[PDB]
């Protein structure tokens, strides 16, 4: 009944509080921040450039690279006044994009669920990755993962009629074989940072803050490249997720 | 808390399995 | 010697919410200190319960964070909240945000108002809650015989007005998907004229928030249909 | 018991129809010092603990639902107005504090209207979009006129398209989720809020980053009748609580 | 603060020493001579000369060989003042070198990694061996493993239609079928030596003095000889390593 | 009875970084006794302790294990080390070339200098650190006004100046893999000229070595940008 | 020590899975 | 009670493997 919002709350009522009624409430666990995005969910797909028994190289194709970025919001190649430059690794973008004309598909990777929901400031957490196979042919195909700020590492062959990427000290992983075709793991919280950026950052990249503002640095799970003879979908699962501040929502359209 | 239901749920060892959560301070 | 195993027929298969964990690639990793931070939170019902505001549409059919009154008892209803989750005027509300992740629902739905208009201003609205069955009111006189409450401007600001959860079954759906339409709907009527005195706005603003009541829960994880910010 | 007083240093602010201070995250900053620095901090310095009271608005009947002004920290005290805490901020590398602060704003029993004040971490201040770097513009400067809501809040892309969405986006009609208090002109003249220290760090580069941000929203349009005092403004008391800093060095040139 | 070098060390300060400060030092375990070289790396690989049907052959073909020494350090069939002995099998060199004109591939197979970074005279350890298929097609492949010093028994078959290498009383593997593509296992520290040279050895191989200077005997963890269908990627894993007398790393380029 | 079992989705796969062992084939297999060696050590942080030395560059361009100094009072710095492990004047340092291995860093640098210069030479330096925030120091008198000390000649040869670790995150990476750039500069300066007597060799080469200093520590161990020496 | 993480970490004996340690002297 | 005859029929938690039961009143 009778209150006053100014001070900045509320009376949070139920029925038996105005009325001759009464608390309906029953137990229930599954609205729980950990629980509820502790899910699997695509956030982009990898297309090898090439070979099992080549050097890796960066390679876009229709919107499909042979590499990306762990992170839940949108990323793709670095984008310049004369177009995003596609001989490049991704990175984080500010906003999501449209491949072509009509709206989808989206030129840019991230995990549109996350995005369209994630009523907090900071969050953190391990992310589960999962990598699994487009097609139906007798794979054979390596991928190589590193932690946020590494480097790519992204040189030459050493031994000649094999792959690149598998020429690391790095978590790297090899399947081949008739009916292996999924790819799965879990890496660990590893940036720099005590907490991540669920959406924006309101200050700049560099300390001459004249670049990428909105955007904080090292805020992403690390990376995968791929090499081999077979496309993937890739997706992504909060483990053991925690959030922090409170804030708005992707904003809904008004029916006309 | 979060979405794993399994008993047998170790094998892999703790520390292994999951970021190693510890206090700065 | 090796175990022997009967190998079932779902081999190979991934599951999206497989209740269990994956192979640890990167062990030993501390993960960066956070003891610091505030702020934190574990339930997203908690969302659910900070009111915020409902959406009213004008002739020329644009937004406000409320509604209008004055020296006047429109015959008809001040403004209609269909209480249903995937209702409009709530798309863009906390609750309605977060409700929309999830299958099914139940308990209080509260209702927030707040009046803005001058100090010097007075009066009473009547603001109702009806079950359906017999359709929705069509006047205060009906609106008067279901669930409700008179609201007295004064001193106090605003007022919590809450929409019972009464109903047939002990959950109801979250969404809109095929067509029973509605659990009921909440009204809003003058009871007596706003009154003032000369030198006043004579027209008065009213905040219209919405927002999870106490008894109020969600349940099963779902995705909803997609969409795209105008 | 709507009378109020608060002091800090040689500084104290006042009310008459207070409605409480609404404290976010239900807890204040500490003036702990940051494990991630080596260095002993400087801290407690009274001369600069205290309320700087400044000019925020002037609100007028124009202004429509969900106009509002953006007023980030600390950089909005960080030069002359925030006199030795600006002057000690200028010098070192970190800064990581709370914010204690009262926005005021009076009019009369014949006035109508009401204000959402309140304060978000990690709050887009971007004022437009930079022609050539595919950048904002003034992140770090207060709104000096009040800014129009988007109808459809989507947020500021830097490419000159549009299309979809921006992650500096900020859906209005959810405000209220933030720390906050109302402001309306039948019940009081003032709002009293506060704020512990959130970022994505133990301490921050503040000379980069404006972690926090004090925002000054209209929820329903200021109203007179034709006599009633028609100049109407907003100003503000804010004040650091605790600040800790460290890594002292030669002077960064906010001037 | 103030100090003297010349007695063979300093003061190994934090903070706190010199100023008004302190030590801010947090646990941390990942870098441990054992847990570090505690994952796996390619060295070389393994290109079979010859059917799962017929007698071994030593044989090579663009620097690759259907045998390889197991060591870290850089190795390939034995040099001559007229170039590499290639009807022979691998063994030390004591410098790495490129397969032709530009500096990749690799003629000489190894641990480029432990090379570029092993900041010790002396180690040792168990080594875990991986092999891994490069191509796609149903195996059928034998693989046969020997300790360092041991008779490579490089002999015909005996029984007609099947693999010499299978023909052993010696570890060896037989892999075949759809889906059946990886060989993994551990063998021991198996060397008639206490412990390993990490780069170097400076003295002869033989009594006369006259050879192989730098290069201790059975200074490695013997070979694999492989034959069938299939190619295959070869990565080692160092298994409870122990490291013995610091010394300095790889020089570095200094940047133009 | 056979045990019926669920095979996951990631059968067959092969993990370089696998937390498990795999198949023994040579077993009961004695690794031959070496009770009798020294020097033996178990963490690689340690060789990160020890010091070594500074690639300070010519115009010529080429390197020294040291830097000059003289009876006089340059006006501007004499050296200076850019706190940042990827940085290129210890390129070849112990300290560089574990961390290079390694993504992140936390804790103190410990900066030595040795002076070899004569006996009957004297004088001062200013050693001194700034943080980021208002740019690298161009004057001995910015300089000063960070974190600082001061070094004096005399029957003692070195000094050891510690670099304190002062970040935003309780970690740092270790590389320069995009471009933040840095963490602050150390930089050395003349107080007082090196003052000496007649007979007296009047340029004095000071030895430049560095080190992790005791709070230091380095994780998650990766593989560097590969290179080929020279 | 070494970068194994594994619970049920036997199956193979001991003296099996490594090579057994033994002191000269 | 059902067509089940499995003894280390666990594996999965029992609030997982099936709807949890839960009197209204």
Redesign the interface.
């Given at each position: 009944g009778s209150d006053?919002?100014?001070?900045?709350?509320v009376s949070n009522d139920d029925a038996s509080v105005d009325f001759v009624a009464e608390p309906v409430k029953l137990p229930e666990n599954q609205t729980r921040v950990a629980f509820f995005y502790d899910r699997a969910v695509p956030i982009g797909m990898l297309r090898p450039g090439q070979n099992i028994e080549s050097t890796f190289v960066y390679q876009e194709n229709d919107l499909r690279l042979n590499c990306l970025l762990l992170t839940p919001?949108?990323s793709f190649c670095p984008?310049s006044?004369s177009g995003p430059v596609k001989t490049k690794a991704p990175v984080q973008w500010?906003?999501?994009?449209?491949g072509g004309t009509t709206?989808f598909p989206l030129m840019t990777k991230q995990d549109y669920a996350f995005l369209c929901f994630s009523?907090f400031?900071?969050y953190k957490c391990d992310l589960e990755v999962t990598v699994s196979a487009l097609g139906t042919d007798t794979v054979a195909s390596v991928l190589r993962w590193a932690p946020t700020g590494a480097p790519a590492d992204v040189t030459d062959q050493l031994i000649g009629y094999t792959p690149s990427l598998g020429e690391t000290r790095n978590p790297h992983m090899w399947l081949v074989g008739a009916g292996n075709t999924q790819i799965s793991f879990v890496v660990p919280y590893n940036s720099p940072?005590?907490?991540?950026?669920a959406?924006?950052?309101?200050?700049?990249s560099?300390?001459g803050?004249?670049?990428?503002?909105?955007?904080?640095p090292n805020?992403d799970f690390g990376r995968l490249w791929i090499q081999g003879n077979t496309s993937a979908s890739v997706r992504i699962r909060y483990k053991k997720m925690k959030v922090?501040?409170?804030?708005?929502?992707?904003?809904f359209?008004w029916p006309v | 808390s979060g979405n794993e239901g399994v008993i047998i749920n170790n094998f892999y060892s703790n520390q292994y399995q999951n970021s190693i959560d510890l206090s700065?301070? | 010697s090796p175990i022997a195993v009967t190998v079932r027929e779902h081999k190979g298969c991934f599951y999206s919410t497989n209740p269990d964990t994956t192979v640890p690639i990167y062990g030993k990793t501390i993960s960066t200190?956070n003891?610091?931070?505030?702020?934190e939170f574990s339930d997203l019902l908690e969302?659910c319960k900070?009111?915020?505001?409902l959406?009213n549409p004008n002739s020329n059919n644009?937004r406000?964070?409320?509604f209008s009154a004055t020296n006047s008892v429109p015959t008809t209803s001040l403004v209609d909240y269909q209480v249903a989750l995937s209702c409009s005027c709530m798309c863009?509300?906390?609750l309605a945000?977060v409700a929309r992740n999830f299958n099914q629902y139940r308990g209080s739905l509260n209702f927030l108002f707040?009046?803005?208009?001058?100090?010097?201003?007075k009066g009473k609205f009547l603001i109702a809650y009806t079950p359906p069955g017999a359709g929705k009111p069509t006047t205060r006189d009906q609106a008067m015989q279901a669930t409700y409450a008179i609201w007295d401007l004064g001193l106090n600001?605003s007022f919590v007005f809450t929409a019972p959860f009464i109903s047939p079954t002990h959950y109801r759906q979250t969404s809109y998907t095929s067509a029973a339409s509605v659990d009921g709907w909440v009204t809003v009527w003058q009871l007596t004229p706003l009154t003032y005195?000369?030198?006043?706005?004579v027209?008065?603003?009213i905040?219209t928030?919405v927002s999870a009541g106490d008894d109020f829960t969600l349940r099963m994880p779902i995705s909803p249909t997609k969409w795209?910010?105008? | 018991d709507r009378v109020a007083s608060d002091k800090a240093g040689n500084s104290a602010t006042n009310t008459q129809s207070t409605?409480?201070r609404?404290c976010?995250?239900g807890?204040a900053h500490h003036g702990?010092h940051?494990?991630?620095?080596?260095?002993?901090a400087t801290d407690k310095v009274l001369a600069a603990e205290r309320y700087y009271t400044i000019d925020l608005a002037s609100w007028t009947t124009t202004q429509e639902?969900?106009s509002h002004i953006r007023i980030?920290l600390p950089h909005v005290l960080a030069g002359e107005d925030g006199g030795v805490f600006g002057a000690t901020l200028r010098?070192?590398?970190?800064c990581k504090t709370g914010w204690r602060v009262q926005v005021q704003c009076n009019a009369s029993?014949?006035?109508?209207?009401?204000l959402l004040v309140f304060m978000?971490?990690?709050?887009?201040?971007?004022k437009g979009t930079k022609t050539?770097?595919?950048?904002?513009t003034d992140?770090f400067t207060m709104d000096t006129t009040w800014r129009a809501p988007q109808?459809?809040?989507?947020?500021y892309?830097?490419?000159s398209?549009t299309?979809?969405?921006?992650?500096?986006?900020?859906?209005?009609?959810?405000?209220?989720?933030?720390?906050?208090?109302?402001?309306?002109?039948?019940?009081?003249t003032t709002?009293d809020?506060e704020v512990?220290?959130?970022?994505?760090?133990?301490?921050?580069?503040?000379?980069?980053?404006?972690?926090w941000?004090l925002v000054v929203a209209v929820?329903?349009?200021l109203?007179?009748?034709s006599?009633?005092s028609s100049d109407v403004q907003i100003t503000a008391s804010i004040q650091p609580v605790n600040p800790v800093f460290?890594?002292?060095?030669?002077?960064?040139?906010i001037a």
């Open positions: 006053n919002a100014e001070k900045g709350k919001l949108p984008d006044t500010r906003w999501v994009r449209s709206n009523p400031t900071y940072l005590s907490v991540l950026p959406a924006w950052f309101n200050g700049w560099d300390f803050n004249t670049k990428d503002f909105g955007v904080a805020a922090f501040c409170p804030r708005p929502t992707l904003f359209p | 700065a301070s | 200190p003891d610091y931070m505030c702020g969302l900070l009111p915020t505001f959406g644009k406000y964070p409320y863009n509300s906390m945000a707040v009046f803005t208009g001058a100090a010097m201003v600001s005195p000369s030198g006043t706005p027209n008065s603003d905040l928030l795209v910010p105008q | 409605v409480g609404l976010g995250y807890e702990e940051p494990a991630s620095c080596a260095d002993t639902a969900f980030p010098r070192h590398y970190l029993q014949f006035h109508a209207g009401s978000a971490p990690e709050f887009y201040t971007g050539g770097d595919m950048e904002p992140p109808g459809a809040p989507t947020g892309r830097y490419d398209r299309g979809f969405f921006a992650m500096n986006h900020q859906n209005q009609w959810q405000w209220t989720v933030y720390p906050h208090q109302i402001l309306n002109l039948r019940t009081n709002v809020l512990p220290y959130v970022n994505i760090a133990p301490t921050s580069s503040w000379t980069q980053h404006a972690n941000t929820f329903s349009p109203q007179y009748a006599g009633s460290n890594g002292l060095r030669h002077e960064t040139v």
